CSV table of C-alpha atoms and ligand atoms in Angstrom, one decimal:
chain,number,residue,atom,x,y,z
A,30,UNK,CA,15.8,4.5,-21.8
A,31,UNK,CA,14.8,6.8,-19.0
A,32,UNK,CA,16.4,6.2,-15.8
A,33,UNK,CA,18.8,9.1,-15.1
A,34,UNK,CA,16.3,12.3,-15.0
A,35,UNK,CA,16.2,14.0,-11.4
A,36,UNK,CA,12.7,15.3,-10.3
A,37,UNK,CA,11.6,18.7,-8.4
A,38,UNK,CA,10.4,18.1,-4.9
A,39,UNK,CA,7.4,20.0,-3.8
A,40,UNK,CA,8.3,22.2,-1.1
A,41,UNK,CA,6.1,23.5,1.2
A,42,UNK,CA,7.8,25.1,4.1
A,43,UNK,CA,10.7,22.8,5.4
A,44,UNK,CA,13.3,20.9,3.4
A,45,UNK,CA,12.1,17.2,3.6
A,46,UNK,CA,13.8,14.5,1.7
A,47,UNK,CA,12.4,10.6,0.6
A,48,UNK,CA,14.4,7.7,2.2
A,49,UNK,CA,11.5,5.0,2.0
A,50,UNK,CA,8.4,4.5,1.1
A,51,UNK,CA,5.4,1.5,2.2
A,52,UNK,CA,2.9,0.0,-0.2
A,53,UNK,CA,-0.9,-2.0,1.4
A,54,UNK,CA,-2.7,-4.1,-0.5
A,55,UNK,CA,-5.6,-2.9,1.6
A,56,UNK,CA,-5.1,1.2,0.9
A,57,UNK,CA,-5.2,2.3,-2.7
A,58,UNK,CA,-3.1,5.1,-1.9
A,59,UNK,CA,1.1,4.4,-1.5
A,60,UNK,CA,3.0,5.6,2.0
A,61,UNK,CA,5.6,8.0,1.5
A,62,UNK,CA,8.0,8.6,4.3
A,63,UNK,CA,10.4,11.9,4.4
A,64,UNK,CA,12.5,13.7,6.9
A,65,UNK,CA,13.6,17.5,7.4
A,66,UNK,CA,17.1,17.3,6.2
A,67,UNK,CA,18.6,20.5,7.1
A,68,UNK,CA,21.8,21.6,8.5
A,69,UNK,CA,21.7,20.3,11.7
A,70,UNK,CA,17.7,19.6,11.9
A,71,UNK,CA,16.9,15.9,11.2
A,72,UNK,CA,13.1,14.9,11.8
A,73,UNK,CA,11.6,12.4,10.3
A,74,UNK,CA,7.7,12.9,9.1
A,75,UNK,CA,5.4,10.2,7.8
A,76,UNK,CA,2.7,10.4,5.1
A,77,UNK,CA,0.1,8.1,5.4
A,78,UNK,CA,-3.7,8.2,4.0
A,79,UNK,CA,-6.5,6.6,6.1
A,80,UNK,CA,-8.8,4.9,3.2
A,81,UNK,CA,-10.6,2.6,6.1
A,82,UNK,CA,-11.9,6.6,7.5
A,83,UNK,CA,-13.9,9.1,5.0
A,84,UNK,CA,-10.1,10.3,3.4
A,85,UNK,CA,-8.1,10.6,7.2
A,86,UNK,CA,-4.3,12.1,6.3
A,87,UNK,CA,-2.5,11.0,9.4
A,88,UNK,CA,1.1,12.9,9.6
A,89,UNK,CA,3.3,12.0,12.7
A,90,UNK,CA,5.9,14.3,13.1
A,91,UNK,CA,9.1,12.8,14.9
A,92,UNK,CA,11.0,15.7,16.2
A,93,UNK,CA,11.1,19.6,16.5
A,94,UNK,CA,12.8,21.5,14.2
A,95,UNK,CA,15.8,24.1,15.2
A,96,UNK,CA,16.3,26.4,12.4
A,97,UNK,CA,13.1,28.5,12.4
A,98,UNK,CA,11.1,28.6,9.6
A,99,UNK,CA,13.0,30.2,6.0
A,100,UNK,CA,12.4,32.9,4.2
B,17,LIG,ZN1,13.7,21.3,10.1
């Protein structure tokens, strides 16, 4: 049994959280959806992987942040 163990996310920068994530039959690779979820700042980035292209990593960002970048 081995359903109760938190993992570490990777940060790199900004303070993104997982809410959802997508799954295509057609792309090998799974879509993982997060969002900058600090104190006041909420934008919402997507994580998707082009396998149609030569490897294309298409990120949208939805919003601006407003708490600078940390330290
Ligand atoms: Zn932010």
């Amino acid at each position: 049994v081995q359903t109760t163990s938190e993992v570490d996310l990777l940060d790199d920068g900004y303070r993104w959280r997982k809410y959802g994530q997508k799954v295509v039959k057609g792309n090998p690779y799974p879509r993982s959806y997060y969002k900058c979820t600090t104190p006041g700042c909420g934008v919402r980035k997507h994580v998707e992987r082009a396998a149609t292209d030569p490897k294309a990593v298409v990120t949208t960002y939805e919003g601006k942040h407003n708490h600078d970048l940390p330290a």
